[PDB]
Design a protein around this ligand. Structure first.
Ligand SMILES: [Cl-]
Lengths: 45, 45, 45
């Protein structure tokens, strides 16, 4: 029973790391889109 | 303590699935914004 | 062994709450980028 809990925790921690990595990718891409939009705003000023 | 832990695991797993689904929705919307920015760059050229 | 499991659970719960707060912040920024793109699209309709 405790082994099964411990193993479930490993799977959850693994999935949580995949989630943190996806959030980091999202943040980088969102930064790039904000920069892109600001470049377009400056062009039409 | 074991049963409480199992109940908490079930909760965590449920929320993790919801988080994964929200990340998938965010990624799709972010891709649409990248396409929208590229279409504006194309158009100004 | 049981206290180690409980401490790890608590750590996973706290990281999950932080992930949910990060997702909320990303969604608000993404909505702003969408409205910024729409504004730019208009300035060329
Ligand atoms: Cl065991």
């Amino acid at each position: 029973r405790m082994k099964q809990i411990e193993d479930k925790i490993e799977e959850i921690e693994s999935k949580q790391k995949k989630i943190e990595n996806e959030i980091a990718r999202i943040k980088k891409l969102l930064q790039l889109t904000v920069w892109g939009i600001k470049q377009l705003q400056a062009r039409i000023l």
